[PDB]
Design a protein around this ligand. Structure first.
Ligand SMILES: [Mg+2]
Ligand SMILES: [Mg+2]
Ligand SMILES: [Mg+2]
Ligand SMILES: [Mg+2]
Ligand SMILES: [Mg+2]
Ligand SMILES: [Mg+2]
Ligand SMILES: [Mg+2]
Ligand SMILES: [Mg+2]
Ligand SMILES: [Mg+2]
Ligand SMILES: [Mg+2]
Ligand SMILES: [Mg+2]
Ligand SMILES: [Mg+2]
Ligand SMILES: [Mg+2]
Ligand SMILES: [Mg+2]
Lengths: 101, 119, 73, 88
RNA sequence: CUUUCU
RNA sequence: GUGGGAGAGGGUGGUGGAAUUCCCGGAGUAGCGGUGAAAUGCGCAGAUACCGGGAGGAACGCCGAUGGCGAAGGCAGCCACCUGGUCCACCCGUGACGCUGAGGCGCGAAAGCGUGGGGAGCAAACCGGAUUAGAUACCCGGGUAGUCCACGCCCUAAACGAUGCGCGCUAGGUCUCUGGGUCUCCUGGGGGCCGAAGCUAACGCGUUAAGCGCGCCGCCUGGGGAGUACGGCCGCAAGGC
């Protein structure tokens, strides 16, 4: 099992209850696939460079997990299913490449 | 009839002609004019001068809908692009701004032989 | 030529592998989502190379433009 | 892939003595490993020719070390093979 | 635009 | 073997935005387009230009290069998975296990062929406009195969560095990509340029040899006839050797 980063962007017009609903299904998914959660980040809403799904804003997440490589792609399918889920991207972890430091 | 005041001024330049389309802040065209829209049938439709008469025309018909200030957009490369603008700027309208919003592809459709040999 | 000023100079120590530093990245783009050359990025082979890939990610997460319209002219 | 630990395990499993790494046996034993994995990777991706060459090269190198083995100690040979699972 | 032969 | 590294090397699955075409709705008229000049063509069943939505196909701008990777053909949106090659440091292990390579086997741009699928844009043939003395062309308007995918076949090429592979030896200077070190330099791998000696008919090559040498393979022996004929092998065919 290797470390990954799970960017996820959902509908920004979610009600705390509708929203809470998503973060839930996500947690299941992650779990169901072996996504051992190492830490999250609730950035919230930010100005997208371009409208996504007609919507001019977006609600970002970020779960750095440690799951089995052999799943990741399937996990990624599962995550995407959710309609209020706008975009999902799972980079592999990477020692930060400094610069001008 | 409508009366708008401010809106968009689309300048579609090319080496073959220049059509100018004035529209409301929603983008729904109010008035338009080409070069041939003023006689000029074949080649002359491209001359920078043609663009001038076009711009002006569309500008007039535009002020007829009560226009006053516009946001100019440009798309194309023609012996009349920057000129048509020279026109609108003058005319009687208030060109708030200018923008080149020509559409370029991040490489997709194979162009006609006429435009190939790119690479 | 283009000796106006470099993007690395007017900047600090940053992780060129950060596909979310929307603030720092925006710096390397031009008056369009277009990624800056080296004469401008001031970066280097290896760097300017990671920049590029990093930027593309941000773009995808809707964090950066792919192309901007040109004001003035 | 073949993880460090997973690999070294084989190295030990075949080394002639503590520290032995580049020994013909260890070596053959080692390539036999890679070869089989790749062999698999092509059970699928029959379309991946660029890797296939690599395969072709590993075999070459192997079917070569062995050649030398038999030539040398014809015993270690019979052993290694039967053990490793080759010939046929 | 094209524009052959000697 | 251990530990570091760069890469458009390859295979599968996803997936992002730009643009074109089409369909829908909005607003809007009289033209658009195209050329040297035009016409064909398309538009009042409302085109062009503009805004919104949708569908689909193919290709991935900037980064991007005098750049990188591969044995060659060749390879660039992003993500994961699977997988090949390779450079370096330590010098730790094996102990000549090496080089070349007739034949064989595999790979092999494009066009082409088979079965099925796909088809936006482009476009042999073709159907039209123009130009011309004529125009079976150049230019303009349409356009089928094809280009796309899968599986099977074909195997060619200015398949080029027009330069077989491996090793040793023979001034430097200069730029560059990638690793190491005591890091305005030294050192290794790769890509360029100018050049010692030397080689060359010359042009040029010159530690990335076309120099000095050894090993192994392929090949040449005046031009036309002709890569034809015949024979043989391969191929569904075209055709290939
Ligand atoms: Mg030793
Ligand atoms: Mg010994
Ligand atoms: Mg082929
Ligand atoms: Mg083909
Ligand atoms: Mg076919
Ligand atoms: Mg014709
Ligand atoms: Mg045509
Ligand atoms: Mg066409
Ligand atoms: Mg040099
Ligand atoms: Mg060198
Ligand atoms: Mg000399
Ligand atoms: Mg020279
Ligand atoms: Mg003869
Ligand atoms: Mg036969």
């Amino acid at each position: 099992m290797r470390r990954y980063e799970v960017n996820i962007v959902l509908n920004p017009n979610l009600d705390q209850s509708q929203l809470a609903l998503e973060k839930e299904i996500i947690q299941r998914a992650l779990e169901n696939y072996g996504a051992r959660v190492e830490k999250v980040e609730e950035l919230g809403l930010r100005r997208l460079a371009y409208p996504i799904a007609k919507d001019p804003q977006g609600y970002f997440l970020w779960y750095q997990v440690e799951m089995p490589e052999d799943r990741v792609n399937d996990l990624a399918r599962e995550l995407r299913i959710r309609d209020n889920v706008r975009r999902v991207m799972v980079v592999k972890s990477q020692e930060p490449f400094l610069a001008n430091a | 009839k409508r009366q708008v005041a401010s809106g968009r001024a689309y300048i579609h330049a090319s080496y073959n002609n220049t059509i100018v389309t004035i529209t409301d802040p929603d983008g729904n065209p109010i008035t338009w004019s080409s070069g041939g829209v003023i006689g000029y049938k074949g080649s002359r439709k491209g001359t920078p001068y043609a663009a001038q008469l076009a711009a002006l025309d569309a500008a007039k018909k535009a002020m007829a809908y009560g226009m006053q200030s516009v946001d100019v957009i440009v798309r194309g490369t023609g012996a009349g692009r920057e000129q048509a603008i020279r026109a609108l700027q003058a005319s009687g309208l208030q060109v708030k701004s200018i923008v080149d919003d020509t559409p370029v592809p991040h490489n997709g459709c194979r162009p006609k032989k006429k435009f190939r040999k790119a690479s | 030529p283009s000796r106006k000023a470099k993007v690395k100079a007017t900047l600090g120590e940053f992780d060129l592998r950060d596909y979310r530093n929307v603030e720092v990245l925006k710096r390397f783009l031009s008056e369009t989502g277009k990624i800056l050359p080296r004469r401008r990025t001031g970066l280097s082979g290896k760097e300017q190379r990671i920049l590029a890939k990093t930027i593309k990610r941000a773009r995808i997460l809707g964090l950066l433009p792919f192309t901007e319209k040109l004001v003035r002219k | 892939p073949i993880t460090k630990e997973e690999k070294q395990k084989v190295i030990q499993e075949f080394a002639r003595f503590p520290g032995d790494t580049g020994s013909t046996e260890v070596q053959v034993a080692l390539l036999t490993l890679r070869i089989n994995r790749l062999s698999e990777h092509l059970k699928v991706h029959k379309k991946d020719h660029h890797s296939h060459r690599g395969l072709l090269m590993m075999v070459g190198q192997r079917r070569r070390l062995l050649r030398y083995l038999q030539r040398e100690d014809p015993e270690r040979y019979r052993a290694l093979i039967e053990k490793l699972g080759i010939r046929g």
